[PDB]
């Protein structure tokens, strides 16, 4: 039903490169490459032979050799998402989709400034913001159902060419304070705890 695609998952630091591959078990007429970021499936390349190149991406297709590749160079945050190849088999004229590659691109934090901040409701409620840590830190979920902790998320302030990681944590339990919100995580020793 599916086409073998490699790798299954990939993490690249910004500015680096890698190659995604699909391996076919029959003769293919043409290949398409897509990328999905809950976003839509965006067409990257369609080709029946040789190669094609567009910006930082390049695709190649060898029907005879039974493979297609997609190269990413100078990886950017916006390259993140799930990539699929899709190929039309010559003997059926039907399209079969690759198993998919989940690509994560890690921003390169020039000057990490790990900190946990308390933020208050615009309208006695607050959340805690863990931010500005390097891609090396991992945020763990809480093991009590009463505290909520999101996975890390990278934002890019284009105007200032600045990128940063953060995760958010919140709770109702009166025992909850930002000082210990992320105790479940291994956070930098020099993490800033205001107040």
């Amino acid at each position: 039903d599916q086409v073998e695609q490699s790798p299954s998952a990939l993490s690249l630091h910004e500015g680096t490169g890698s190659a995604l591959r699909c391996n076919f078990t029959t003769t293919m007429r043409a290949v398409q490459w897509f990328r999905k970021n809950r976003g839509s499936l965006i067409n990257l390349f369609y080709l029946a032979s040789g190669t094609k190149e567009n910006g930082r991406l390049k695709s190649a297709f060898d029907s005879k050799e039974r493979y297609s590749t997609l190269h990413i160079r100078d990886a950017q945050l916006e390259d993140s998402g799930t990539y699929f190849c899709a190929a039309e088999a010559s003997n059926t004229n039907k399209v079969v989709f690759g198993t998919g590659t989940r690509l994560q691109v890690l921003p390169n934090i020039q000057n990490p400034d790990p900190a946990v901040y308390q933020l208050r409701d615009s309208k006695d409620k607050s959340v805690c913001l863990f931010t500005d840590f390097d891609s090396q830190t991992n945020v763990s979920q809480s093991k009590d159902s009463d505290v909520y902790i999101t996975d890390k998320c990278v934002l890019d302030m284009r105007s200032m060419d600045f990128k940063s990681n953060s995760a958010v944590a919140w709770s109702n339990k009166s025992d909850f304070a930002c000082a210990n919100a992320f105790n479940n995580s291994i956070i930098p020793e020099d993490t800033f705890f205001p107040s």
């Binding site: 007429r29 043409a30 933020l119 998320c153 890019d156 302030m157 284009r158 105007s159 953060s166």
Partner: protein
């Protein structure tokens, strides 16, 4: 853009009809419907060239009704919805039945559940930047929390001065369960919008977190005491603040 699918999300109860629409890219007469599951498998359902069916499967023929009328949107309808129909329904247009590239729409994410009584819109809140962050970094992070919603069918956006922004924004890839080891658990989602301190400190600047929720429609019945959990936007906002 090219291919326009509606609605982006859909929730229905067991046994109800579920209709979705696709407007193919102009100049592309062939329309394909795929059903994609959580394991990223693409299951071909049916395709049309103009008003005619070219290929399809037995399931689609027995369980669905699909048509591509002249000068109207293509549609695909599940006659009697079942849990197992929950999936992402993708429409692609193409020049031909074969040997031509696909262009996809944004899909319709369908969820089919036992009881629409569990459907809830989100409450939304905006949390203002901490002064410590402003002093420490000369930047200001606003946080939006959408909470208590079900199903997890929302689109969150930030609007600064009445214009949607993308720079400086990050929204959780997936909403989290407020009670993980529980089916029908309601959900929460957070997002951040980060700006320069000076931009936050300008009281003329206005920030709004908008959450589009996809829920019931007008034709849906509702005999509950609480407000009918219809498709709707819920927002929260804050003005910039001086030192």
């Amino acid at each position: 853009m090219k291919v326009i699918q509606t609605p982006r999300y859909l929730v229905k109860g067991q046994g109800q009809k579920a209709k979705m629409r696709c407007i193919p890219e102009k100049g592309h007469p062939v329309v394909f419907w795929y059903q994609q599951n959580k394991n990223n498998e693409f299951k071909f359902l049916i395709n049309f060239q103009n008003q005619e069916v070219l290929q399809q499967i037995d399931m689609t023929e027995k369980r669905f009704s699909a048509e591509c009328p002249s000068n109207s949107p293509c549609s695909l309808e599940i006659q009697s919805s079942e849990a197992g129909d929950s999936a992402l329904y993708l429409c692609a247009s193409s020049l031909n039945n074969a040997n031509s590239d696909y262009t996809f729409g944004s899909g319709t994410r369908l969820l089919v559940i036992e009881d629409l009584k569990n459907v809830f819109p989100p409450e939304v809140a905006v949390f203002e930047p901490s002064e410590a962050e402003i002093s420490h970094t000369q930047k200001a992070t606003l946080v939006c929390l959408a909470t208590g919603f079900y199903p997890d069918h929302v689109e969150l956006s930030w609007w600064v001065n009445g214009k949607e922004v993308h720079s400086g924004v990050c929204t959780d890839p997936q909403p989290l369960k407020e009670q993980p080891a529980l089916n029908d658990s309601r959900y929460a989602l957070s997002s951040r919008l980060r700006v320069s301190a000076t931009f936050w400190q300008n009281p003329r600047n206005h920030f709004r977190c908008q959450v589009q929720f996809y829920g019931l429609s007008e034709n849906d019945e509702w005999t509950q005491d609480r407000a009918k959990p219809v498709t709707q936007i819920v927002s929260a906002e804050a003005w910039g603040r001086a030192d």
